[model samples]
Target: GGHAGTTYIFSKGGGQITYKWPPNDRPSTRADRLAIGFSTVQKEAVLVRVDSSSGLGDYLELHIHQGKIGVKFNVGTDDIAIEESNAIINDGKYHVVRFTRSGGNATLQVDSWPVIERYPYRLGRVVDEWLLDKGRQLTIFNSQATIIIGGKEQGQPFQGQLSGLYYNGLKVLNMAAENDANIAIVGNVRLVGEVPSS
Candidate 1:
């Protein structure tokens, strides 16, 4: 292989990469964003790989649920706002995903396409069935920031390759040989790629 690439086969029901941040560096109670690039061959699975601890101690997830991109934001208390898109990205190809929040709007995109265009909701405070409500406010009290790629901490595993994982525009992780410090493989995860031209 003479091209630039790295691949991992995340067997159907298992295999995942996890990154645990130090307590001092955890996400603050501020607006934040995330971006990840991955490719899968499964027709249906959970790619809701990113989750962080909220002020309420609950977790927030941004992932591909049942073929559509979805997100569950923890807004403190038992109230949470869930949003998703109609775009299907189950095709066997590489796709980029980004979830960002500015003030009260949450935007989720896939492969440069805006899926969850605009979902506004109050950051904290409990509301009635906010999950089914089209509220216009958004907030993330605390993201007990931890990154899990390929799948969740357990279950909902992925069966493909993940590359170019970034947070806040910083290249945090990727499937390249130079990303050894950013990733720790487990289970059946294996790497395959070619050296980049110097």
Candidate 2:
């Protein structure tokens, strides 16, 4: 549990936590959903929260790309990248983000705003397929998949406060309540109460 009624993860940029997902709890299912509530003090930072990888050349990732929030999903057959731009979320205020994908379609939203619509595509089938063929995946802690909070495997860490987190509609990690010890925090991140509304 946290000190205040609601707790939040405070990151000063070079901080994050990693949690290994159990086989049964993996979000590999096609229709997986993810939601997060957070606030960032920096105008620009990377918020890579969840990441998964397989030796067979498949992976999934959700993060704040450049300033907008979105996901990068690769299901072996298709490589999907959808993000909600137009809105700047790193304004040092609270905001909620939800991303869901079902088969060939997907949706992205922030602070209950209009959906950041996108279409699905597969490698070799589209001209944009070339972007999916990056390079050999690297090793950090060597796990099938890890749920990262506050940052990604490699990048400028997310500088902000994470108030809520959910996977598949279940409260996996709540900074506002009791936190699971399985989460490994690195660097100088703290837990603070929710930011008051203006």
Candidate 3:
């Protein structure tokens, strides 16, 4: 029962990582296995996805608590947490995190539920209609893609390692916003694909 359980293993190498968790705990449900990696390199840390054995797509990540380990979330319908107080890193503990893309947006929550932060997006062409369409499961860490932490000469909104990653939501589609089909498609595609070219 819920008394004892087995261990979960995650290991990888190089400029990326891939970990795995077995047995579908919730089949036919909005969920996916999560994987995560960590690093001491400034801004070089990020989350990577390996999907599930079921071939289900998921989100992977790693990040500092930034605020109190007790505090939850860094971004969301709320403003950016540029100055977190409790911060997860203050105590010097390595927090490995993971998540999945059940559908639209990706969320960070406390103990695997109550979301903490979020990276949102609108519908578009170049988007992942199912998961990438309405929202994105975070670009994870763009340290290598940008200059800021990557030290190239650019800036990014979501930087550094993420503390967690996973998938938890409904179907992968823009339920309502489909009314203005043309505008939604054009804008979504443009915004999703318009990354800086450095």
Candidate 4:
């Protein structure tokens, strides 16, 4: 069994793809899993970014720097950055990236590599009380959101293919190709590949 797959090609000239996330996913899980597949030769690029339109809620950005993968995020309390200096990913080969965020703790993995972690909040009962109220309030900012993928102004423009991006049960690339009205595409980005079914 497999999920539907769609690929988006972004040229060096840059472009942006905007989609309203959570679009209507009534079942929001405490564990936020974001996944995407990409292949690029650029050593630096911003793969995906989730932000609160008001700029007051938690936000996260996934990027590639020096051929390595790194993530930076804020969860209402503090800013956290998790960088994986190993496992270069700009080799022009497809890479499936997975980010699992459970509360303030998160993990990142590229392909089948070992997981890289980020834990801004420590353990204990004192933290447990805070964690109890954390999961739902952080991440996306109370429906204030936009899932933007690449743009010259967004950061270093990504030059390659991005496919099967799924977040919180939303298959964005597929929806975009299917012509969901919520999606707005700009610049030179285009769909160049797709899995026949599922």
Candidate 5:
């Protein structure tokens, strides 16, 4: 457990999932922005930040390869490299998808191989379906933001459609750019709302 700490799975069974987190939780800080960096290995993933005592845990999902070919930007969720598409994952197994982001640029992978690397500034846009639940709820951490579904930060039962509510079908989603030290990154941002991708 270093500075940022880490999230892990607690247990797994026939059809159940659980996670374990540090007791103290991460320290809160004020920042104008945050950065994301990743590599691929035939896996799909979404980085989540748990906040709020009641709300869907914050989420930074990377499920854009729903209907396409190659690692290029023009891909689909069907093209995602996840091992399980419809399984409850506690160990972040569902986050199997992976890619790299730096300075508003992104590098996508196909079957664990690099395919497209471009400044996704004008490319990705939050999927349209999320607009369906316009008034759901969103929480921001530092300079980053995450989407909430049913459960709030502390796993509170949201108003409706918390379980069995999956946001499928993805599009551009979002983009950004990083500076030379990789410290300062900036660019356009988009988020998938409560509804699945359209």
Candidate 6:
């Protein structure tokens, strides 16, 4: 009950978890990466999100859209989103997702398929289809405080198991399962396995 990946299942019925990110784990504008193991059949779902309450837009998100993993982030300048034309994932099967970046340049990988990189725009400017959502947010590489898994207040809830999640230098899922003082479990998210009955 105090270990990570004992089948951390999130019920479509409703569930989410939040953990405190280490003070030193802020994303690197020069180089940063995030990865996780997830399985689901829903066409849309939220996997993980690291958000800074500072409004600097220093956030990271891994979500599913049109059956494949979608990457969204803002290191400092522009809001970047990478969508893969292939990689169908809504088949109730587990898949590994990796997202890494250097400055605004990034790469997305799904279970060994060809790695997908950002569109090549030598001008250092990628015209994103999405505009500011009225509340203008940009990555300031601010102090990232919390790690959220499975959507909560503003995103689609996920239904299925989520395993090993690796961030800057933390295994947040393990922290959650351990009932770490910083973890907050909400809704129907269940950490599988038994306790010592102490």
Candidate with the greatest TM-score versus the true structure: 4
Candidate lDDT scores, in order, read 0.58, 0.61, 0.27, 0.76, 0.25, 0.75
Across 1-198, the per-residue lDDT of candidate 1 in tens digits comes to 111244455664566666666667776444657766676656555554445554445455655666765666654445445444556776766677778765456677766564575643665434556653433223544546666766646456677766655665445445334565545657656666555646
lDDT of 3 at 99: 44
TM-score of each: 0.68, 0.69, 0.26, 0.79, 0.24, 0.78
**lDDT (C-alpha) at residue 70 in model 6:** 89
Q: Tell me which of candidates 2 and 6 scores higher on TM-score.
A: 6
Off by over 4 Å in 4: 1-4, 21-30, 120-141, 193-198
Cα lDDT of candidate 1 equals 0.58
Report model 6's TM-score to 2 decimal places.
0.78
Candidate 2 structure quality by residue, lDDT tens digits, 1-198: 212234456544467667766666554454657776777656545554455555654555666656677777755455678877688776777788788766556788887688877666564566454443322122111223666766534665676666556766556456224566556666766666555755
Worst 10 residues of 6 by lDDT: 129-138
lDDT of 2 at 172: 49
lDDT of 5 by residue, 62-85 (tens): 332222222221111121222222
lDDT of 6 by residue, 88-127 (tens): 8899877888888775568998888988888556443433
Clashes within 3 Å, all models in order: 8, 2, 24, 0, 26, 0
Error of 6 at 75 (Å): 1.9
lDDT order, best first, reads: 4, 6, 2, 1, 3, 5
Indicate the worst ten consecutive residues by lDDT in candidate 5.
Answer: 170-179
Residue by residue across 165-196, what tens digits does model 3's lDDT show? Answer: 23333211121123322111111111112225
Candidate 1, run of 10 with poorest lDDT: 1-10
| Cα shift from native, residue 25, model 6 (Å) | 8.1
